[PDB]
Subunit: 310 residues, 4 copies
């Protein structure tokens, strides 16, 4: 679709970022990925971000990315498919073009690699990536790539296909300035690692959607929180925070990278064997997986038959 | 008043934190302060925080604090008066007791001095301060004193006079967890330096008021923003952010400590003789004062205005 | 003594920062403090910093500080006594004058309270404190008070009694620039938490002494490390780092504030009634105390 | 060469990290690169790191890296050539094998991309990269990849070809612990931005060499500072800090990324056609290039 069409889709509901499934040999496992994506499809997120951060973008070989996007497209139905993109300009442009070729509906541009950069340089980098494709682009303020409002305004003026802004900084002061400056020129996407913890505050900042990483494994719970958020049903949001999210955060905070690793464990627990994380992430221990299983609780989508003899 | 009465007052509108006025010899200028407070009183903030951060608490001798509190109380009218308090436990308790004696309605407890401390030590320190007085206490999460939700819950269960929570961290994740845990047990006060920049977001976090430092010198504009915030008039809030607050931020960001220095400059520009900041703050350059004067623009205090 | 005399003493050996002793009722325990200081004097540190950071300066009432300085002065002999000082300018000046009155040979100026400040403001604050007394002053780069080299040079030109510079930032780039700019105008004092971990690197930066917090309870070992440092005996320094300091660091890193709490625990283990730390610090658990005792081993008194 | 031979070379002098030359269109300019590398070779650094950080590794396509390494090898003479490597494991292994194939003598492993990672994950990633090649590996503690001493010891026990450790953290406390733990098992390389500012302190930490980015454009000055350093000639080191390095640092601190951009400007000022930086770095302004030219001063290579 064209950039205005993906822009519309971004404003039409909750955003899905599926984990990328690997086999025991570490290879992309398309059959498993498709099974999981097809299940998620019944929950009707309007945009699916393949090979995003929750999808371990940062551990994929660039040649894997179009393959993953194409697999998601097979089963995503009437859903917009956005691909992760990133690294320095030369690599990012090659990835962007390769996923445009395989029919992505947009790109989410993760930070360039390693260095701190001046605003003028961020401008030049992001402009070059946006101009390399005709599909829609969402920028992603996080880590070593944080656009100021004036720089983002210049990008918006010179790149019509730049239609979205995702925040991973948690800097309310800055993101409210950005929405004040750009208004409806961009769709504003919450991007903190467990975004429900920020969503009520982010409404005031001007953001009415976000990536729900936990939608990977408790989509019914994530959809309910989202509906409650949009309806102003504070007591419902709060109950779900207290009973699910803060306990999840306690598991997630046990080690670096668990914002991804714990989500992938949840997916496995729900009966999709998404496989291990790639180093340098590490998987949850069997004990920690058990903690997450207990938390999922009434939201389990199956029962397991654990091995036993006599 | 009793802690429940200050608690109620904290929930009744916008919070005022007056700058502390100093004279030529560097001393607290009580006439000028009282004059400024009396003018501010016309703009009807329900709570006045004397000798808070904006009031340069961190540069006051402890014996100056009761003098300043007493001065505000003289001319503040039917307005709750909360005093700054801070430092390590031994100093904080002395300060707290001294301001209770001159009729403070509460204390805002700024961080202890210098060190990083374990949660259980924060708990011990804050508990001792709360237990040293009968008036209401508001804790203040910022810098080297950041309470987690569980620690704060323990304090609330053991110190009935602990009735307010100010945030200066900007950590949305944490403050939402805090309001979810405590609910109406505490009043939640926004406390980022230029808090209007955060107010709309903080509503969703569970906070419906904040310290407006700029109320010191453009109380009308600060009231206009607050009214629009509480009414859900986003376009009005946004106009004021774009036309006044982001330009103010550009000035504030030119040097460390300007969150206080630029406010004091604004007060002097509006004709209240607030004097210099105390070191280690510095005052704005004449160029910067000029920038603030232009920004104040149509909100300039005029000789022909009616009180 | 005059600032040039405290300056010379700062360059004559290892620096001692005794913990401040408190009794059951929570007051300063002068008898206990004096007993501990008198024992430490046997180990011959040329300068003793009373009510510094390790001495819980940040938890003391301003009127306690002269009492502590006076107690140290009673028993320290031919040792220079520097007092902690800090907070904002009005409080700092009052402390500085009060300790000069009871005979402090110098002050160590800890950061002002709470706020981040511009260089021009740090200049104004520090200058006012220096000009309030005749005794020597050491500034202390740490936390919210970090002087750049040009600002410190201005202070040195203006304030003859400013004679020392203590670093607690660990910013090797900055401290080398400072020593290159000022040269022998100042004495350079290492001030990281557990400064032996930094001492060999700090030699190259231009610093040949530091505060040894562990001198509080293993003064002999601290002296052994220092002598090896100055003699260039790397294998000896390294043995002591591996066998004592990194294991100590492992205990210290178990909780915030243990850079002070663990040292105080060590002092109590050597039979001095130093008492508890003041909140918001917390004391070591019994388990942790046991670990420290085992580590101290044959250095037990 | 074998890992022990590259290890010996790392301990034999100063380390050179040439900027990667680009044409106006941003493409690798091999002829200009080789001219500059040949000029630097007269100053006898024992190891040349091609496509390191100063060489804009982070802006190169993986397929460019072997071409740059091969270019350096043409003209570097009897000099060990180490290639940059980095990113996540899948990319890093392919880069490592590609530069081994063009005859690199080692790899310097820059951080993986983007994420914070647990120590056990860093271990697994770095082990897989080390085991993918037979040439020497230097790890690089920087940003989102900071090995603790115990993790590094595990890697050293498992990976005999891991022979060097470069520090970009400035964490003196940690690096001294690492040298105390590993001793002569590793060669210790200073890796801060403008490393001469740290070199005297780093001696005490156990480091006797470092990357000299400014060697790109004032190699005589860099060699003299290094010689004074190893001779214990403090007044000479200090004079060069005061007269050259602190003024350079003032230019460097004007904008993000200038640790690379200012060095590349210096190379251009000395008459080599190094070209622009790639975004998201930016080049110095005309005003700043004038400042640097004035600073180079008596050390100009030509008029």
């Amino acid at each position: 679709m064209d950039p205005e069409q993906i822009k519309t889709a971004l404003g039409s509901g909750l955003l899905s970022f599926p984990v990328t499934h690997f086999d025991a040999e570490g290879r992309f496992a398309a059959d498993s990925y498709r099974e999981h994506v097809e299940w998620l499809a019944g929950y009707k997120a309007p945009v699916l971000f393949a090979a995003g951060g929750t999808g371990e973008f940062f551990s994929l070989k660039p040649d894997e990315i179009p393959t993953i996007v194409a697999a998601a497209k097979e089963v995503a139905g009437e859903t917009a498919i956005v691909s992760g993109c990133g690294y320095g300009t030369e690599i990012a442009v090659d990835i962007a073009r390769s996923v445009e070729k395989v029919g992505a509906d947009g790109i989410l541009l993760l930070p360039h690699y390693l260095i701190d950069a001046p605003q003028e340089g961020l401008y030049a980098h992001i402009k070059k990536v946006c101009q390399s494709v005709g599909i829609g682009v969402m920028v992603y303020n996080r880590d070593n790539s944080v656009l100021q409002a004036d720089t983002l305004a210049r990008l918006c003026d010179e790149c019509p296909n730049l239609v979205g802004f995702k925040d991973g900084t948690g800097d309310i002061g800055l993101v409210r300035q950005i929405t004040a400056k750009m208004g409806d020129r961009l769709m504003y996407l919450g991007g903190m690692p467990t975004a429900e913890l920020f969503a009520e505050a982010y409404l005031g900042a001007g953001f009415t959607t976000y990536s729900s990483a936990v939608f990977n494994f408790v989509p019914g719970l994530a959809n309910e929180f989202y509906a409650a958020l949009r309806a102003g049903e504070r007591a419902t949001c709060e109950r779900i925070l207290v009973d699910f999210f803060y306990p999840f955060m306690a598991i997630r905070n046990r080690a670096k990278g668990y914002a991804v690793s714990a989500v992938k464990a949840g997916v496995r627990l729900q009966g999709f064997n998404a496989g291990p994380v790639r180093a340098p992430l590490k998987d949850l221990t069997n004990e920690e997986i058990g903690m997450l299983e207990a938390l999922i609780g009434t939201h389990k989508r199956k029962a397991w038959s654990h091995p036993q003899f006599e």
